[PDB]
Amino acid sequence: GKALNNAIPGGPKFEPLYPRENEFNSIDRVIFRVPIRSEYKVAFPHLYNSRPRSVRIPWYNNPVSCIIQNDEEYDTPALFFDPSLNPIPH
Amino acid sequence: FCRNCGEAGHKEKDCMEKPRKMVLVRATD
Amino acid sequence: NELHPTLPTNHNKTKLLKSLKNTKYFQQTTIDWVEAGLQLCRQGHNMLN
Amino acid sequence: VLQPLLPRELPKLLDALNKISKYYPGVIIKVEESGEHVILGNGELYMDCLLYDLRASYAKIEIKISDPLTVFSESCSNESFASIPVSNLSISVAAEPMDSKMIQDLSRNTLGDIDGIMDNPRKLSKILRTEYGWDSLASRNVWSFYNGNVLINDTLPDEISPELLSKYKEQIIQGFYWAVKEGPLAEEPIYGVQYKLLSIIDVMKSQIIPLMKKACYVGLLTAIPILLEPIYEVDITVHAPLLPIVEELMKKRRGSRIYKTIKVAGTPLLEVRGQVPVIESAGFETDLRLSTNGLGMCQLYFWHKIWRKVPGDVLDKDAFIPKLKPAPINSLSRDFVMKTRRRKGISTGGFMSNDGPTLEKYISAELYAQLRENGLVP
Amino acid sequence: KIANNLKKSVVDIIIKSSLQESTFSKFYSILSERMITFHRSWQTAYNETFEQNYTQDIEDYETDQLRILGKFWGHLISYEFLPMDCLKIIKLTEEESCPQGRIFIKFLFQELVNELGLDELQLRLNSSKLDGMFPLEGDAEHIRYSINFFTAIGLGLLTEDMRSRLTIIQEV
Amino acid sequence: GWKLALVSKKTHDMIWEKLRYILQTQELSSTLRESLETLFEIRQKDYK
Amino acid sequence: SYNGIGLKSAKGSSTSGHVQRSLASNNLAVQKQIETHMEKREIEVQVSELRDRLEEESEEQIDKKCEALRAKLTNEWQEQQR
Amino acid sequence: EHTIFTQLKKNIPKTRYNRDYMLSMANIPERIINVGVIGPLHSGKTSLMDLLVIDSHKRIPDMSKNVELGWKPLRYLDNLKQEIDRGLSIKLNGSTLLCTD
RNA sequence: GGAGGUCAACAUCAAGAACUGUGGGCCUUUGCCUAUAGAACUUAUAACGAACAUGGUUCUUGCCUUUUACCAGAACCAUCCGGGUGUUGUCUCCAUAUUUUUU
Ligand SMILES: Nc1nc2c(ncn2[C@@H]2O[C@H](COP(=O)(O)OP(=O)(O)OP(=O)(O)O)[C@@H](O)[C@H]2O)c(=O)[nH]1
Ligand SMILES: [Mg+2]
Ligand SMILES: [Zn+2]
């Protein structure tokens, strides 16, 4: 975000570090469809914006968590089939 | 609601009682 | 803070109190914290006056 | 679509592109006539990794890339209304849509036999009549099965001797290949059109090769041309109480229905199968992960090879294109065609010029004039 | 986000402030258009305020403020933010009309002629069929009064249909 | 079920134990399968 | 979100740089050619059916039988055209 | 900048099973078997390969104290700046080693 | 001998993914290849410190009467509060069988 000069909606705002600012991206020839809002330019930073200088590549994902907590009444055991879980039919 | 207080207002991190194993306010002038 | 590390110097490193200790002029004791604070206030007033 | 920022650094780009065409085997890189290099990858992460390696490892220059778009194709509808001889020697050809069952069988390269087809024509001729229900004549006579669509000879015997036909068969089949490789609307490949040619030394072959392509362009543009878009399929994994959020998001994609919904046993998960168009999918993977706070994950894949009609009308002068807002769903098919013709330098040199792909470029002044007099083909 | 009951009061303050300057300005037209294209409630507030401005508040305004109301409501009717059928309330008889009403109608039709151009205006006034404007039922003195009013504005070309009907009902 | 959880939680718990055992290890009818799975899928919400 | 809009920074601008959406901005012979080709094609489909039925279960006999079928069906279509 | 890779030949990992006896078993064609480890995203195939790598070598030089203790997985065959930062195998990699049933 | 120290000294801590020693051969010591022994601490969403300050010079800006004092981005460099591990010393408290194996 600092390198690209964008602002993700709840974080900090810096200076550009490249403050000096053809008919390739003209209006007639580009198909306007699904706007390229700033989260996409942060997430995939070599695809959505030209000239990424000083940009590093940010850890695609972690799989999906399904940790189940047990905080109610304590008298439930450690191993217990939670009401969140789907059944395993036959 | 909160696990140890038993009141419905707040969250488990916000309960002012001590965590267990198992009110007048200044009017805004 | 995370963008610019300032990377400490791991050689010679003269520390202050470890070299102020080797003199005969400093001595050592244990006192209460509030007494040490009051003594520092008396000393730091006396120096600047 | 990619173009280097400083043109004097174009060789250092071009060399490096060849490196990528070795190391990434899924890419398709081609250089258009307008100099702009277009590259084709499996998906959004794949293009990100490509442009990292192109920007930091190999070329070490700076390049202006376009925004994401897709590769269209094109096909036809009901039937061609009339065979039109084309002369520049007079080759005529008519067009028809293929069977809906035959396209999904040629997509996986099987009949019923395998590629390469038609080395044994009796074995092929049994299959079409046994399964697909053709006549005996066309099942006897198929000259080619090129990659998406079939060229059959119908014929007229007593109109031309078949030794004159088979003296020139390689040249007219090369003309069919050369016409399927780039099509009439926006030089996009033609996908799923049963051609039949109804009526037609080395100099004659070099006259035949560019004339069969023009004939096929007339034959396709008579037969109600439509535009086809490719559709990703989407494999979603969300927690179960976050199921409606996913459904809400699909309504913002225009063309993204949800087919199947499977409850993963013993886990608090729920696995959702449903399609999305690929031109709608430039930020699907970000929006799903943000709007479900990380309790969802999608994977967008294209290995069934399904292609759907782009909604609208291609030959429609009247539909408006709102210039930095997305198009209505009836103007959308025209919008894609016109923007692709302006990327590929086809129409010309003008702010919002309307050189629609009409049929009059190929045929005649007067014959198109009578087609307008009947009001058939605007 | 003013509540639904006070939207008519907001529209009233906007019109009363628009009257106070020495001339009409497109500020008070643009803000009214961006109100009407936001929600149905603002459009029903303006469709109420046009009737409340014609039936009640006509009698109090001087001609300097009635000229501004003419250009304002004509400029809203001209760009179809208000329907033409909202013009059905005004009547043009000798008993129903008043002087402060007829000056307002003159300035509204002046604005509609300037913007639409006497041929699109003919098309709209034919398609909307206003009985107060064009009485083709009979009543020779009323249709005479309407013809005389539209010739005294300077319209003329609207009046050919009503003049033909008045001649054919004088000849019988 | 939310009322039974509100007062007698151990009897409710053993009810779900037996019902889950009936669903997930039994030769059982298909309409009863879709009804019991509807019970579980709304037990996710427990009577909105 | 900085979606293409807004200042680059509020440093030299003498403002706060607080940006907000605007609620006011939501807003024939050729037909006879194909029919002739359809009729001649149906006639040729008949003799290709004859070739399929003959050769399915005598090259010259099948070729002459197909030629005689084309002759008979061509004369029959010359009679059925008038 | 690009890979993490062992350029000094003397710093090779020291192969418990005597690689010359591994190369000698390549003469019999039925002794060699080629297996590819495929599967879905983030399922464990690189760490599965990394178990076999750890048990086949004596001293891996890139093994830190944390990947010994078991906090962070050694992703030995990920090997690239892409696959370390993105956390995601993007290119196929392999290892040829001998194993006993 | 054993445990411990808000005790000291001296080495060492950011690099072809990267360490040292030894034997043999080649070049003429350095270096290359080959066989061997050991490697504590730190490090891969990269670093001693799940913590985080200030100073110098040169660019680019911001407040604009000038210099300190400043606004906040970049590059190159330093100072400071701290940390690990190893060797030695010192100090304190205690201790002196019925088919392939064999019937
Ligand atoms: N919770 C849990 N995580 C595991 C387990 N095994 C592997 N993982 C995690 O799964 C993640 C994926 O591991 P990898 O093997 O590197 O991923 P992959 O299988 O190669 O899939 P790719 O993205 O194609 O490499 C890692 O972050 C591991 O921490 C496991 O048994 N339990
Ligand atoms: Mg992997
Ligand atoms: Zn509480």
PDB file of C-alpha atoms and ligand atoms in Angstrom, chain H residues 45-46 78 89, ligand 2:
ATOM      1  CA  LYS H  45       1.951 -32.879  -0.274  1.00  0.00           C
ATOM      2  CA  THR H  46       5.051 -30.690   0.107  1.00  0.00           C
ATOM      3  CA  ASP H  78       9.376 -25.064  -2.475  1.00  0.00           C
ATOM      4  CA  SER H  89       4.091 -24.354  -4.880  1.00  0.00           C
TER       5      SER H  89
HETATM    6 MG    MG J   2       3.324 -27.874  -2.743  1.00  0.00          MG
END
